[PDB]
Amino acid sequence: AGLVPRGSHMMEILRGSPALSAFRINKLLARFQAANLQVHNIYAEYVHFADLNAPLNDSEQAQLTRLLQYGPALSSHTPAGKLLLVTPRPGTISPWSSKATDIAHNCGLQQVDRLERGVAYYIEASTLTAEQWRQVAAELHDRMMETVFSSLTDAEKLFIHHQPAPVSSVDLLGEGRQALIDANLRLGLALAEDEIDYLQEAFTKLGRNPNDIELYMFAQANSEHCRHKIFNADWIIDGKPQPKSLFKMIKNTFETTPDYVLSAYKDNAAVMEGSAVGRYFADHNTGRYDFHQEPAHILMKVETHNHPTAISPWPGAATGSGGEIRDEGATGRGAKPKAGLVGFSVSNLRIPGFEQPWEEDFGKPERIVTALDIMTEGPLGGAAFNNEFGRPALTGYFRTYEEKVNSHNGEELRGYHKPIMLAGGIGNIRADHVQKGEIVVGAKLIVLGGPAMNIGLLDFASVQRDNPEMERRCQEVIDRCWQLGDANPILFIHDVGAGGLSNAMPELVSDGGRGGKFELRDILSDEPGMSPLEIWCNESQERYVLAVAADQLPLFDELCKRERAPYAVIGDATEEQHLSLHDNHFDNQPIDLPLDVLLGKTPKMTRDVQTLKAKGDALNRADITIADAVKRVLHLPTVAEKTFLVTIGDRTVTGMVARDQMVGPWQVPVADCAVTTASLDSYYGEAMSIGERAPVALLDFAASARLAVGEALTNIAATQIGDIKRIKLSANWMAAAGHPGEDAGLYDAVKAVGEELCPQLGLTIPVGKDSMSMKTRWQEGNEQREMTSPLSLVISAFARVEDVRHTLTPQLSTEDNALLLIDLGKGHNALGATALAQVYRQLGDKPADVRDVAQLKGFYDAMQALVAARKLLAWHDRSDGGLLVTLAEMAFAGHCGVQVDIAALGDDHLAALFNEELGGVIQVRAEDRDAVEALLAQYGLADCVHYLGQALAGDRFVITANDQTVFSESRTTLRVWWAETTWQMQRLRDNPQCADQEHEAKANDTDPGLNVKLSFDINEDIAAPYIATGARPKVAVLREQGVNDHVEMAAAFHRAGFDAIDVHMSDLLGGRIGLGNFHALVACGGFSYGDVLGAGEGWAKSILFNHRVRDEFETFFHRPQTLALGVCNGCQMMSNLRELIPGSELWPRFVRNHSDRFEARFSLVEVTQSPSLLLQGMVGSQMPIAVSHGEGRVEVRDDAHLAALESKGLVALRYVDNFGKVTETYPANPNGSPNGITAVTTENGRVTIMMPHPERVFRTVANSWHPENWGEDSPWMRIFRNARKQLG
């Protein structure tokens, strides 16, 4: 390794591993070929850079080298051709750096000041002008985040230490108002004239110049984004002043329906009542996990991240999720996120080679990315945060829309060049923490979370950065705090978002009626160059602010240190309502303002506007046939199979997921809503649904809003809730404010829901948000061009659930059955702004709408009655794609056919099939048909209800009208058409061989779906005689920073009769726990250190390189009767500890999945013959299990080691396909493991490691699909019971 001076430090250069798999290499050479760059070869190697504050000895040096060996064992090559080194941009620090540096430090390498990584490309192309070489460089890096260098030694620039820049005053006293004008332009404050006036007066009054930092702070606080001027404005519309602001109209819903609401409009989340259940967590005093029977109340929030996603979609989506997760955690006095949702709206995908006939290239601004790039990288970013933080992503929407239409302002381009990137979620909260506490004078004011950098200030300022593992460490602290109940030391907590500390700290003291005084140099920073303005105002991620009483600081400090969550006390709350920021380094005072000056307002806005309303035009059906329409509609991404957005995101973490997107044996993503259990011990729960219908707003603003509320309801309706007043909404409003017609449209739509529909249904909207510049302008040759969004209301619905077991899905039964349409359209059959119109490049005439409020209410209540009485076999609502899609999706999910007659739905068959009016199809038992129709009739629905026919075994999808066949096709053929979008996305994003295997398996109708074979009685609690003695052996539930499934792991061992003890690696390191006291160990899953330096490696190496902790592990494993289990991240960890584990010499490594993608799957495995004591009695069983990993591929050293492993009989689980054979085809085998291997054991059988998560599926109710007759325990419960019985 290289070692040179880097200013006051030394920089070491260490060569790492080959970086690109063969299919990635081929993709690059293919891209070079298509651009006419004649490249003979390309090879890439990771390279690591260590900036050292003192030397390493030989032992330490060998440690560092070893830390930096990871990754798949790809073919290595001696370098050749021209070097192009890609690194993060100078002045930035990669999340990889943050995590890898933490590993070095936890391995005792304090000398390592910072680690960073690049990629060295070696390109052989002996032609190539220098012009072409810049094109080559351009293809190998992301211009928003990375730079390209010619030497390895250039990485020195990444570690330059700049001296702290001083505060700068803006010279109002010396130049007058011109100085504020100049600063406004120079610093991009975007101040209005009246804000310049207020600032000029405030500072004239104080008699001194404002500092740059004070102006910036004021500018961020008073932006549209932070102040919500539009939503608080007075309105005049068509000449008449209006009585309410938009905000007041939303609040009207709470004044009408306060029921169940605990908190609305006074926190960064709403809270509603949940259920009394067993809240499961480890006691502060014993470290033991125990159930605490108490209300688990339900918080909800939804946010957007639209602008940054247009610039840098991966971090834009990741931090959109990250911001939202902080809002949840900082609700009240601390709360716990549970499950998430995700939304995207983009322009047309225009997938190379898969152009669809409605798509036209209209151009875009150079400075934004394409719709395709957003849908490639954005969902990966959103999922990276949810996976590595550890909340399951259980529902979502994805719409594409880009067309030249005759809308409210005449002919123009309407679309989503600036996308919607939506993230939201639910969490749980204790009753006594729902209310923010008061801030005592002298309260310590703390920043919890990550060291700041210059983020948020070619738009580099919109390039965000995510570190989910940092946020997980913070959440653990928050959890520790709320888990102390009455001794929770958190007095007040708030997230840090827009404006950074300059917004969050003033907001916090002000919400408590206090001031604060702050010390700039107490704030944690990874960028010593930063000005006070940059420190105070940057939008660095994973930070929270809180207030704690001075006498609780020692407790807080203990809590943070055990979690490894960084924190700093940065000031004190004062009685005086003044804000002071001091700088110890420059000995001065960057901020010194009364709060009333800083937080004082300009006058509220008045919007005086007028109504525009499109006529819109009858659908021209010249080129439309029913058959062609079916093919086109199934190819609209809006309609099409969403797998590329679903399997990339964990859907099992917490162990509380009852209903995820994937439905049935064939795991078809058509679930209409998400459902979680409230605890690990209850069937009470929570549900999430989304409704949205933006294109309708191009014809009718209020109908678009009414339909978003309506579809939220129709998506959630087959979940057992009861009173509709249990359902609470978030309303997120996206608009191009100021665009002609949109303002009046916005007012009308908000009124349509806030003043009319929601009050009439009894639906509260206790939370919500707005994004008001949904348009993009650019110059496109000669001309000005503009792409403006429709008004885009996204409704998310949230509800307490009475029994999660009674949820229906779209999965049709083929037992004797009746299919009934509930047509809440009442025969209007509207076709305007449908998927059908869109796919023929039209807007059409009149859209759907809520036709009858009482009937919508009735529909809901009748569904609730049918659900509760168990009278439904299946449900699927009608939305994009109409009845045709509803029926098709039900057939896909049931893996069957339908025989339906539409003669009663009107003579216009096209309109009957493709209207997107509210309603849906219920399936009931044939014998229940008359009673079900009677029930519906007593809710006023008889004329909306139509018997369609039946679901039948087979492959025929048949629609008749009297004796005419309207449409007939192979259900498989439709299902594979419907799959083509996700196929093409997967194919261009992931390993094409895997995308293609997954796609091609859909075309095989003989696939029997997930199915089980059990070698034992699932219901026999073999641990019960032991549990009945009341002797409860301990299990060390072992977690490292970033681990996230430790709670449900504990619960599984607990159900089997153990006392589950929380053992953090910090507990082992500080002697608080010794393994000598345990007979059982389990290393849990998650993303320890964000998987940086190879999944499980930092965890393992921190054990190996500390000799004491290492001896402790080794001793545990060499005892004669100890048991250990490693699951997922713990399997990876323990595989890196072979040297401590007897009988583990043939164990493989676990590396990047062959798909090159995180795989969240419900996969079929079989239990194989091995010594594993944890699998006793189960050999020959086949059943599905939760899978949730990116690095699960078994990799051996060579074939000799694979054969040896196999011959020793150590393989304990294998992936099988649905025909029951061992497989390596994807995704049946989700990772590419040879011989399906996904668990191995030791020779003595006492240690077992496995990639899947049995702890996530020990409850039948948490199995995405399961046989109907199972009781409460899944087969996987037997693992934990086998461990108990084995201990005796």
Ligand SMILES: Nc1ncnc2c1ncn2[C@@H]1O[C@H](COP(=O)(O)OP(=O)(O)O)[C@@H](O)[C@H]1O
């Ligand atoms: N962006 C997304 N992320 C995750 N899941 C999504 C996303 N978009 C859609 N889904 C899921 O895919 C399935 C189909 O979506 P969609 O057809 O939009 O739902 P619906 O038509 O019932 O409103 C649903 O289970 C939905 O939650």
Ligand SMILES: [Mg+2]
């Ligand atoms: Mg759909």
Ligand SMILES: [Mg+2]
């Ligand atoms: Mg639906």
Ligand SMILES: [Mg+2]
């Ligand atoms: Mg929808």
